[PDB]
Structure formats: structure tokens, C-alpha cells
Write an enzyme that holds these catalytic residues in place. Structure first.
Site, PDB file in Angstrom:
ATOM      1  NE  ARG A   1      -8.994  45.247  22.645  1.00 15.70           N
ATOM      2  CZ  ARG A   1      -7.773  45.161  23.168  1.00 15.70           C
ATOM      3  NH1 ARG A   1      -6.702  45.470  22.445  1.00 15.70           N
ATOM      4  NH2 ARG A   1      -7.624  44.768  24.424  1.00 15.70           N
TER       5      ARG A   1
ATOM      6  CG  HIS B   1      -2.794  41.779  20.412  1.00 18.39           C
ATOM      7  ND1 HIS B   1      -4.143  41.883  20.153  1.00 18.39           N
ATOM      8  CD2 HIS B   1      -2.585  42.431  21.580  1.00 18.39           C
ATOM      9  CE1 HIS B   1      -4.725  42.566  21.123  1.00 18.39           C
ATOM     10  NE2 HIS B   1      -3.802  42.913  22.000  1.00 18.39           N
TER      11      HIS B   1
ATOM     12  CD  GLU C   1      -5.888  40.355  17.627  1.00 15.33           C
ATOM     13  OE1 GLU C   1      -5.981  39.844  18.765  1.00 15.33           O
ATOM     14  OE2 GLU C   1      -5.636  41.569  17.455  1.00 15.33           O
TER      15      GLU C   1
HETATM   16  N1  LIG Z   1      -1.721  46.659  20.777  1.00 14.20           N
HETATM   17  C1  LIG Z   1      -1.523  46.193  22.019  1.00 14.20           C
HETATM   18  O1  LIG Z   1      -0.676  45.091  22.265  1.00 14.20           O
HETATM   19  C2  LIG Z   1      -2.215  46.851  23.178  1.00 14.20           C
HETATM   20  C3  LIG Z   1      -1.460  47.281  24.265  1.00 14.20           C
HETATM   21  C4  LIG Z   1      -1.962  48.255  25.124  1.00 14.20           C
HETATM   22  C5  LIG Z   1      -3.226  48.794  24.890  1.00 14.20           C
HETATM   23  N2  LIG Z   1      -3.972  48.363  23.821  1.00 14.20           N
HETATM   24  C6  LIG Z   1      -5.316  48.904  23.528  1.00 14.20           C
HETATM   25  O2  LIG Z   1      -5.215  50.270  23.180  1.00 14.20           O
HETATM   26  C7  LIG Z   1      -5.945  51.096  24.056  1.00 14.20           C
HETATM   27  C8  LIG Z   1      -4.990  52.143  24.611  1.00 14.20           C
HETATM   28  O3  LIG Z   1      -5.672  52.972  25.520  1.00 14.20           O
HETATM   29  P1  LIG Z   1      -5.023  53.345  26.941  1.00 14.20           P
HETATM   30  O4  LIG Z   1      -4.215  52.200  27.423  1.00 14.20           O
HETATM   31  O5  LIG Z   1      -4.382  54.675  26.818  1.00 14.20           O
HETATM   32  O6  LIG Z   1      -6.359  53.436  27.837  1.00 14.20           O
HETATM   33  P2  LIG Z   1      -7.053  54.840  28.222  1.00 14.20           P
HETATM   34  O7  LIG Z   1      -8.344  54.590  28.906  1.00 14.20           O
HETATM   35  O8  LIG Z   1      -6.141  55.630  29.083  1.00 14.20           O
HETATM   36  O9  LIG Z   1      -7.331  55.569  26.812  1.00 14.20           O
HETATM   37  C9  LIG Z   1      -8.604  55.532  26.198  1.00 14.20           C
HETATM   38  C10 LIG Z   1      -9.077  56.954  25.920  1.00 14.20           C
HETATM   39  O10 LIG Z   1      -9.775  57.000  24.690  1.00 14.20           O
HETATM   40  C11 LIG Z   1     -10.943  57.792  24.815  1.00 14.20           C
HETATM   41  N3  LIG Z   1     -12.018  57.288  23.928  1.00 14.20           N
HETATM   42  C12 LIG Z   1     -12.926  56.292  24.195  1.00 14.20           C
HETATM   43  N4  LIG Z   1     -13.731  56.138  23.120  1.00 14.20           N
HETATM   44  C13 LIG Z   1     -13.355  57.016  22.168  1.00 14.20           C
HETATM   45  C14 LIG Z   1     -13.837  57.276  20.889  1.00 14.20           C
HETATM   46  N5  LIG Z   1     -15.017  56.790  20.521  1.00 14.20           N
HETATM   47  N6  LIG Z   1     -13.240  58.255  20.120  1.00 14.20           N
HETATM   48  C15 LIG Z   1     -12.170  58.970  20.625  1.00 14.20           C
HETATM   49  N7  LIG Z   1     -11.698  58.708  21.898  1.00 14.20           N
HETATM   50  C16 LIG Z   1     -12.280  57.748  22.661  1.00 14.20           C
HETATM   51  C17 LIG Z   1     -11.325  57.774  26.291  1.00 14.20           C
HETATM   52  O11 LIG Z   1     -11.831  59.033  26.678  1.00 14.20           O
HETATM   53  C18 LIG Z   1     -10.020  57.458  27.005  1.00 14.20           C
HETATM   54  O12 LIG Z   1      -9.468  58.627  27.589  1.00 14.20           O
HETATM   55  C19 LIG Z   1      -6.524  50.209  25.148  1.00 14.20           C
HETATM   56  O13 LIG Z   1      -7.904  50.449  25.297  1.00 14.20           O
HETATM   57  C20 LIG Z   1      -6.267  48.782  24.707  1.00 14.20           C
HETATM   58  O14 LIG Z   1      -7.466  48.173  24.282  1.00 14.20           O
HETATM   59  C21 LIG Z   1      -3.476  47.408  22.975  1.00 14.20           C
END
Ligand SMILES: NC(=O)c1ccc[n+]([C@@H]2O[C@H](COP(=O)([O-])OP(=O)(O)OC[C@H]3O[C@@H](n4cnc5c(N)ncnc54)[C@H](O)[C@@H]3O)[C@@H](O)[C@H]2O)c1
Ligand SMILES: NC(=O)c1ccc[n+]([C@@H]2O[C@H](COP(=O)([O-])OP(=O)(O)OC[C@H]3O[C@@H](n4cnc5c(N)ncnc54)[C@H](O)[C@@H]3O)[C@@H](O)[C@H]2O)c1
Lengths: 9, 331, 331, 9
Positions: free
Chosen positions: C241, C290, C270
Site C-alpha cells: 500500500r 498498481h 493514485e
Molecule cells: N500492488 C498490487 O497490485 C496489490 C496486489 C495484491 C495485494 N496488494 C496489497 O498488498 C498486501 C499483500 O498482503 P497479502 O495479500 O499477503 O495479505 P495477508 O493478509 O495474507 O498479509 C498481510 C500480513 O501482514 C501482517 N501485518 C499487518 N500489519 C503489519 C505491520 N504493521 N507490520 C508488519 N506486518 C504486518 C499481517 O499479520 C498479515 O499476516 C495486501 O494487503 C494488499 O493491500 C496489492
């Protein structure tokens, strides 16, 4: 799948 | 007096200096061809250090009178007529194991750049493309593909190809290779599918990557005939040698859409330009200027080994004291 | 009559149509904000489908009178006030497992682009840089680094981070992570080093990659204070994010040289532009709009799942029939 | 290694 068959085989 | 050793196509010898100071006289020519080499060097030089920017034919080699050893600072030695050098009594050496993982890392970067469009999306964003809605995300990144289940075809499973294969497993690539010189068993040990003909690889691979040395039998390996054997909308990666791919055939294939995208570090005529040659603005092309091998550590590593090979030649026996001689059979 | 379900920030419903035709009335708003939403939709709509381009505060949510379900087509749901929606009785769902490997593949591409300079070398070659000698290969590719032995730090070892970790092993990265919410044991099962504080990760990592969801406690996680805790000449990758990184602090760090390079798919504001915002031409920056999640299969996959979540809401029970509800605790 | 110690620790 994504890609198709070769032009000439 | 002490033997003269010349760097043919370079100007920097700072890394080699501490290894040769007491055993050899160090000079450099900074030459693109054998024409720019000073008459003295042709007469006196016993040792030679060189890169890829200078080709040595049989003509060039028999201008040297005292030359006994050529060491290539780097992997490939296609630019050196190794057979002819052996006839004259000149040992040829290389440095094979300095930038193996550097090259495999750059190759994987190239593969991924084609699949995920990271470079082209950055290029789009550089050129002021505005992406607001999800509709225009899909539009600008049109052609981005899921990796798992796709087939990566490797031509030449040597040092680099083997390292590429291991890395490719982690992404979910189905990995097969073609290598007519390796003996039976390599495929089982590494857990890879193997095919017996070039056409078989071309028929099955969604992404074709090149990792074979340029030799007598593989020049223009990817030509007008073999390009047709590749799948519709296949990717091509070439970080091996430029003389392996027909650039005229590749260009035509890229424009028509038979090859969806290509990533090249090596080209037929170097230096490469987007204005000069057959690849004169073909769509979906990513090019790097022979820089897949590069890292400071790798650069120092191969230069020190090359310098050590020179020292082994002057102090010890040819070709016994040598470590990485590639023309023992021609001497 | 049959329940109204509206796509808030899009215009295309072709993939959702066959799944909802008989159970719901399908409309779309193509809205950037709650202001552009037709009065009818606010009154009538029971279901809602949305992406990341529209934020729903508590204000926006209590304009809806019949809304019972919001489904986010995609992973992250930071743009939806999930607590507030629960107070009003609106179930919020996401699609977590559609583009996991797509994102991890794009992230690895970003990491490698920083290490091997593939994008910048292509950019150089686009802009007519001539590379002839080995000296100018080293010059244009200055900063290209050997991967094996380097430490990759992962912040948030969820779905994506876990997939990035597995891929990173193959390149020779020493992989450590920081995740204050995962219970003891994950590090042993996957064979990864784990650190207990954010500063500990920042102190040890040569390349820092972000894979945590945006929440109450991690906004501007990489700020003026924490940027200093990062190593001299470290890489930053952010495909999680944009609200996680202070772009003013990042810009300053990139110009001074404290951060050697950054790769961003997500940004604070964005759509992103190289002309607008704090990152206004900072050196060594690679940006994608993105698009790390994107592939045709993933796009169809999440849209069909999202459409199925809507159907489960209308036919079955809230929040029982739902599959990926993220605010059961707030209802 | 390649990278150096953080500016402030
Ligand atoms: N760039 C893109 O086009 C796109 C695509 C997919 C996902 N994303 C983003 O990226 C993230 C990827 O995560 P995911 O899909 O594996 O979800 P996920 O829930 O499996 O992973 C998130 C993990 O991060 C941990 N976490 C939460 N807050 C934290 C912090 N303060 N410090 C350290 N760790 C923390 C949580 O314990 C959780 O296990 C998503 O949340 C999404 O917003 C973006
Ligand atoms: N792009 C760069 O900056 C750079 C860097 C490193 C290497 N290279 C080039 O790429 C090549 C990488 O090979 P390597 O370092 O693994 O050496 P290697 O000898 O270990 O690999 C070559 C393999 O290819 C096989 N082969 C030979 N001809 C073939 C053909 N006709 N068809 C299929 N296979 C064939 C051989 O059996 C051999 O095992 C080198 O030869 C070098 O020229 C370029």
C-alpha cells in the site's frame, strides 16, 4: 493454454 | 627484461597490476581491431588479455610472433579462433565461473519483465500515461500473464542454464531443456524434463531462453525456419550470444505477433542501437547492452583469475600449469 | 422486482453478468467518489461491488439505506471503513487468493530490476547511450550487485510475502521477516529467520520489501524516523500500500543516496505521475501503476468469486453463507 | 558487505 500452436509444424 | 603482456581491447589494468608487476611488462592497446595494435605488441608480446569487443581470426593470430597465451576475461570465447591458435602453438584460456549467478539473475529479470511488463509499464508511466480506473490498468498492462503452469524452454543446460532452471522452479514454471552434448542423467538429477530435438523444445515452450555458447553448428539457430516452430505468442530471451538469433527473422516475428515479446542482452552487431540494424523499432522489445554478467565482485573476480592464468603461463608450463585452457586438443 | 447490486467505481460487468442475471439487477456508477453516485443507487442498492479507486468513509456508508453487503474485487480493504460498516449492519467481503503469485512475481521483478538494473539499462539504451568498451559497460551498469549473500527483509509474511520468500531463496537471498501478528512457528516451518521489531529488520536488510495490509497502526510506517534505521544504500520495494511510505522522506533519501533505489507499484496518491507529488523526479525510481496483481486469469478469477459472494448474500444468510467476510466481529 | 551501517542507530 495462453499460447497457440506453431504457424507451421 | 621480462615478458610483455598486453590488454588488447581495454585501457584499465588496475586490478591485474598487483598480480603481474614482478613477472610481466603490462601494456594496453585499447583496440577495436587488430589494425590499431602497435607494431611492437605484435612482435614482442608473449601474453594477451582480451574481452569480447575484439575478434581474432587466423589472419590476426599469425601477425603475433611471440604470443604463447591468450586469456579471455569472461566466459565465451567464440570471438577467438581457438583451432587456429592451437595450430600456431597459442594456448587459449577463459574465466567460466565468475558471473554465473549474475547472468542467471539478469536472465530471470528478463523473463519476468516480459511476463509482468514491469519495464514497459514504467516506460508508459515515464511518457505521461494516466491510469485511473481498473479498466485502464487492464489496458496498459494488457498481455501480462500468470506464470504457474507455463513452460520455460532452455537451450543449453550449462552453468547459466542450470542456475536459471533452479530459479524457474520457484515461480511455477514447467522447465524443460535441450542439450545435445550432455550425457544421459542430468535431467533426473536436477528433476527437469528433457527433449531430444530443437523443434521439440520450440513446439512445447511458451518462453524460450538461450544459454549455449556460439559454435560452428549453431549460428543463426533461431532463423526463418525455426522461428515458425515456436509457439504463437511465445517469448524469446537471449543472454547467450547475438549470433544465435536472426534479427531480421525476429523483427518480422515481433511485428506480426508470432513472438509476443523479446528480451536481448546480446545482439548480432554490438554496440546495439534502436536506430541501427534489423531490429529498427520492432514492437515489444527489451534490450540491455551486454550487461547481464556485470557486478563489481564478478568484474574483479574474473580479472584476478585471468591475471593469475597469465602468471601461471609465464612461470610454469604450457598447457600444464594452466587451469581453464579450452584448446588442449588443438595444441 | 429483484435486489439492486451496483458496481461503484467501474463500468464493466461482463464477467459478473452470467452469475447474477437471475438473482440481481445489475447497474454501474463509474464513480471516483460517493458524490457521483446516482440518488437511486443510494436508496435502493442492497449489494455493492467495488475496487480500490473509491474510498468509503462512515459518511458515505450512512447515505446507503438498503445496503447489506459490500464486496471488494481484490485483496486489500483499507479503503473501506470496515468498523463503521459493521455498526450499520453492512457485511464487507474481499477476494484474497486470486493474484497472490502474480503479485509475488511482479515483486520479484521489482527486486531484480533494482539489483540488475534491467529497466534503467533499457532506458539508457532507449535514450541513445552508446556502449562499446567494457569500461562503459561497467559505467552505465554502475551499481549492479551480486545477489547471493544479500539480506532481503520482508515486512508482513502473509500470502504474498510468503510467496516472495520462497522465490527469494532460489536466488541466494538471506531471507528474514517481521510480522508482529503471526504466532510462533511460521519461521521454522518455512525455514526463515525472524526478527521481533521493525528496527531490527531495517538494521539487517540490504533490500526491504513491503507486504502488509494498511491498518490503524502502520500508516507512514517508513517515515523520517524509520528511514534513518535503514542501511546505507538499501533498496526499497513497495507493492503493498502507498500509505505505508512517506514519499517526502523517500524522495529526500533517494536524492542524498541513503536509499540506492526504489520500486513502487503503489503510491500515496493514485494515479501516480512523475510530475505530480513529492517524488517529483527523485533519482533511481522505478514505478508501475498498481499493476502487480494483473493477469487475465487473475482478473476473471476475482470477478467471478466476487460475483459469487454477492449471490451467496442475496440467496443465503448474512454473514453465514459468506465465504470471505472480513468484519464478522463488527456486526 | 555492499551496504553500510544506518545513518542513526
Ligand atoms: N500492488 C498490487 O497490485 C496489490 C496486489 C495484491 C495485494 N496488494 C496489497 O498488498 C498486501 C499483500 O498482503 P497479502 O495479500 O499477503 O495479505 P495477508 O493478509 O495474507 O498479509 C498481510 C500480513 O501482514 C501482517 N501485518 C499487518 N500489519 C503489519 C505491520 N504493521 N507490520 C508488519 N506486518 C504486518 C499481517 O499479520 C498479515 O499476516 C495486501 O494487503 C494488499 O493491500 C496489492
Ligand atoms: N550476456 C552476458 O553478459 C554473458 C554472460 C555470461 C555468459 N554469456 C554467454 O552465454 C553462455 C552461457 O553458457 P555457460 O556460461 O553456462 O557455459 P556452459 O559451457 O556451461 O554452457 C553451454 C552449454 O550449452 C550446450 N550447447 C552447445 N551448443 C549447443 C547447441 N547447439 N544447442 C543446445 N545446446 C548447446 C553445451 O553442451 C554446454 O553444456 C556463454 O557461452 C557465453 O557466451 C553471456
Amino acid at each position: 493454454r495462453r499460447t497457440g500452436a506453431p504457424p507451421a509444424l | 627484461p621480462r615478458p610483455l603482456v598486453a590488454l588488447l581491447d581495454g585501457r584499465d589494468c588496475t586490478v591485474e597490476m598487483p598480480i603481474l608487476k614482478d613477472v610481466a611488462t603490462v601494456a594496453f592497446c585499447d583496440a577495436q581491431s587488430t589494425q590499431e595494435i602497435h607494431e611492437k605488441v605484435l612482435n614482442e608480446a608473449v601474453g594477451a588479455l582480451m574481452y569480447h569487443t575484439i575478434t581474432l581470426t587466423r589472419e590476426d593470430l599469425e601477425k603475433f610472433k611471440a604470443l604463447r597465451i591468450i586469456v579471455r576475461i569472461g566466459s565465451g570465447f567464440d570471438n577467438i579462433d581457438i583451432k587456429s591458435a592451437g595450430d600456431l602453438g597459442i594456448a587459449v584460456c577463459n574465466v567460466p565461473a565468475a558471473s554465473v549467478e549474475e547472468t542467471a539473475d539478469s536472465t530471470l529479470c528478463h523473463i519476468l519483465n516480459l511476463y509482468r511488463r514491469t519495464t514497459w509499464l514504467h516506460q508508459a508511466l515515464r511518457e505521461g500515461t494516466r491510469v485511473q480506473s481498473v479498466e485502464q490498468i487492464r489496458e496498459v498492462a494488457s498481455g501480462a500473464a500468470r506464470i504457474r503452469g507455463e513452460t520455460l524452454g532452455i537451450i543449453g543446460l550449462g552453468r547459466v542454464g542450470q542456475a536459471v532452471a533452479l530459479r524457474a522452479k520457484a515461480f511455477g514454471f514447467n522447465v524443460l531443456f535441450y542439450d545435445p552434448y550432455l550425457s544421459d542423467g542430468i535431467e533426473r538429477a536436477l528433476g527437469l524434463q528433457r527433449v531430444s530435438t530443437l523443434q521439440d523444445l520450440l513446439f512445447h515452450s511458451d518462453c524460450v531462453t538461450l544459454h549455449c555458447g556460439l559454435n560452428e553448428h549453431n549460428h543463426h539457430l533461431i532463423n526463418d525456419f525455426t522461428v515458425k516452430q515456436m509457439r504463437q505468442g511465445a517469448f524469446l530471451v537471449n543472454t547467450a550470444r547475438g549470433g544465435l538469433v536472426d534479427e531480421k527473422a525476429l523483427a518480422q516475428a515481433l511485428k506480426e505477433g508470432r513472438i509476443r515479446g523479446a528480451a536481448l542482452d546480446v545482439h548480432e552487431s554490438e554496440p546495439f542501437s534502436f536506430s541501427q540494424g534489423p531490429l529498427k523499432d520492432a514492437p515489444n522489445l527489451i534490450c540491455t547492452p551486454h550487461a547481464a554478467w556485470y557486478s563489481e565482485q564478478a568484474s574483479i573476480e574474473m580479472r584476478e583469475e585471468a591475471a593469475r592464468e597469465i602468471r601461471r603461463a609465464i612461470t610454469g608450463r604450457i598447457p600444464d600449469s594452466l587451469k581453464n585452457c579450452v584448446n588442449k586438443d588443438h595444441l
